[PDB]
Amino acid sequence: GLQFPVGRIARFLKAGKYAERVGAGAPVYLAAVLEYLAAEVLELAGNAARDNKKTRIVPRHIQLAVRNDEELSKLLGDVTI
């Protein structure tokens, strides 16, 4: 049960002109990955929202959740707001 859109992502690779052909392994495989990379930057940004004592995530919460964890500051960068 993936949350992210296999079809829509399949189309994004074709129309993107990344390749004229795609085996439906890729959109599935790629969708699963963008889901996990959100399900990290949320399980952290959402913790941030209970540190600064709230229940509404905002740019300040995401910036802190990223920069503190090493891997996600390498991946994403500074996150200037």
Binding site: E43, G46, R50, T55, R56, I57, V58, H61
Partner: peptide, 11 residues
Amino acid sequence: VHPDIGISSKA
């Protein structure tokens, strides 16, 4: 992951 928290527009 956090069923309890929304998110802004800029966020």
